Amino acid sequence: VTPIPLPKIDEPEEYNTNYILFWNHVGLELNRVTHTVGGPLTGPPLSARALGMLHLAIHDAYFSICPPTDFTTFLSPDTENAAYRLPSPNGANDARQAVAGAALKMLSSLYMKPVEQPNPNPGANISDNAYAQLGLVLDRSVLEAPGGVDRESASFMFGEDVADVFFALLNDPRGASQEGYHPTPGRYKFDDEPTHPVVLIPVDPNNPNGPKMPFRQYHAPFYGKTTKRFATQSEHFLADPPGLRSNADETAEYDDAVRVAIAMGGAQALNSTKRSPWQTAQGLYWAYDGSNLIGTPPRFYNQIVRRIAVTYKKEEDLANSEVNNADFARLFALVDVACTDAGIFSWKEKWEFEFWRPLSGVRDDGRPDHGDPFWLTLGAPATNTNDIPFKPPFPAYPSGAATFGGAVFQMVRRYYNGRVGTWKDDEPDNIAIDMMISEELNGVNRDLRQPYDPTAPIEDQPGIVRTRIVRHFDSAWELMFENAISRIFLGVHWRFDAAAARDILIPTTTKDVYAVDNNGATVFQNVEDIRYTTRGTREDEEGLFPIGGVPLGIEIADEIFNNGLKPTPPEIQP
Ligand code: VO4
């Protein structure tokens, strides 16, 4: 197969001289490649899970050889339960090779062709080319690994054993299974996307030009309720969204949300769209919608975290500093585990409520003075492709990206508190970064005139180039905020999918109705003023629960960090 020419990453080449960062990078490369060829572990929740598994293996492999002081390994060597028992180094003392072994074994197990039975049903959809393309990435990473790879070393072999334990423990082969699920139409109810109601997929993936068959995808409807959690110590729930169950009476919030959805997330040339050019940029910047050569949101969050890590590293030598290695190893384990669990819980709630997307809500509203039967959103950008392909659909509430961001950035905050500065766990931090470029707006990627050619580099393919925008952020609190609201600008999520409207919008004298500027564009509170404290009720449970994905993510990250990254007790696993 012809190797896919991957575009250059906007990041200092010095980063990959550190082996921890190098392996994180390989995981990121596999993420973007798998979404380009349609391989395994695609979609938001599962792509996050792969990174969580990769980093847990690296974490325990490294720390087994170089024991930490203020914490321990995820699994222990003395665990009576064999499934949770970590292997012994027994002489192995080369952390570099141990990490290499863990990373390579995990990634290979995750992306290899499931010949061992799983080929049927599960893998029966992924082409052999998809597997070959992924194999290529793994093959060249071995050649690029700083310090080389020695598969004959006891240390490498030890890393491999660590990976085997984690893979056997946390891999969910049936992850995105939709077998048996069917939408339950009605008001507020999720259903097939009116702009992409069906997909024509080949009967034989290895014969893409042969007969096709209509298919209706539903992205992982059972994953959230049945999959094994990583480090969360309890179940997390959200308040009922406006219009459903206990909050069925919040019609003022719902109606105003529809109003805002139309003005802020409609297609650019619609007379009803009030979103500014700058807000459109903010919307695209955080997208990462499983596009060709781009991948999913977890990949971008990792790109951002890489810069933060290097920017605030304790020692200057990226290559030979054990302090830096331990630092990066611990940080990424925490960040990616939180990302994995955020994906589990956002998906659980998504499919629990089955709340419809703004597109369907506005079109099927039914009230002449509220809806727009012909409304169109700016939508999630279909980057490096000539059309808007069918992307696996899933409910709106809560926003997956909002949740991912909440967990990832709150984790970064908890981890760097006292070091970069000092702040309350629920107040803005000072973790600033600059020269942060999104692959959605990097002056290289584009919207093609013809179908993507996997044999040619992106710059040689005709299309409209995405403007290059270099950003600077004042804090992780800001990153978290913008990442969440960008979804409103895209028109893919309701305001409450991100967080409680009262916590992010400017209120008026009318309850549940928020302010807009001269142009009719919604006004947001200053990032420094934002506090996610507004809560709501649940019909099935007593108490007050958070509203939206950001609060959920923060809640998840705080719990994992407070417990010091400990395995979810098996007694509470599904
Ligand atoms: O990925 V959302 O679920 O944030 O569109």
Task: Outline the structure in words.
By secondary structure, the protein is mainly alpha-helical. The protein folds into two domains: 1-175, Phosphatidic acid phosphatase type 2/haloperoxidase (Vanadium-containing Chloroperoxidase, domain 1, Up-down Bundle), CATH 1.20.144.10; 176-574, Vanadium-containing Chloroperoxidase, domain 2 (Orthogonal Bundle). Helices cover 40% and strands 5% of the residues. The chain contains 16 helices and eight strands. The chain has helices at 19-37, 44-65, 95-111, 128-144, 154-170, 223-226, 251-265, 277-285, 297-311, 322-353, 358-363, 400-416, 476-490, 495-498, 501-504, 549-562; strands at 199-202, 212-215, 433-437, 446-448, 463-465, 470-473, 535-536, 545-546. Strands 1-2 form a two-stranded antiparallel ribbon. A two-stranded antiparallel ribbon has the order 3-6. The two termini are 41 Å apart. The protein binds vanadate ion (VO4). The site of vanadate ion has 8 residues, from helix 12.
The gist of it:
This protein is mainly alpha-helical and 574 residues long. It has helices spanning 19-37, 44-65, 95-111, 128-144, 154-170, 223-226, 251-265, 277-285, 297-311, 322-353, 358-363, 400-416, 476-490, 495-498, 501-504, 549-562; strands at 199-202, 212-215, 433-437, 446-448, 463-465, 470-473, 535-536, 545-546.
What topology emerges from the helices and strands here?
Layout: H1 19-37, H2 44-65, H3 95-111, H4 128-144, H5 154-170, E1 199-202, E2 212-215, H6 223-226, H7 251-265, H8 277-285, H9 297-311, H10 322-353, H11 358-363, H12 400-416, E3 433-437, E4 446-448, E5 463-465, E6 470-473, H13 476-490, H14 495-498, H15 501-504, E7 535-536, E8 545-546, H16 549-562
Antiparallel strand pairs: 1-2, 3-6, 4-5, 7-8
Helix pairs in contact: 1-2, 1-3, 1-4, 1-9, 1-10, 2-3, 2-5, 2-10, 3-4, 3-5, 7-13, 8-13, 9-10, 9-12, 10-12, 10-16, 12-13, 12-16
The site of vanadate ion has 8 residues, from helix 12.
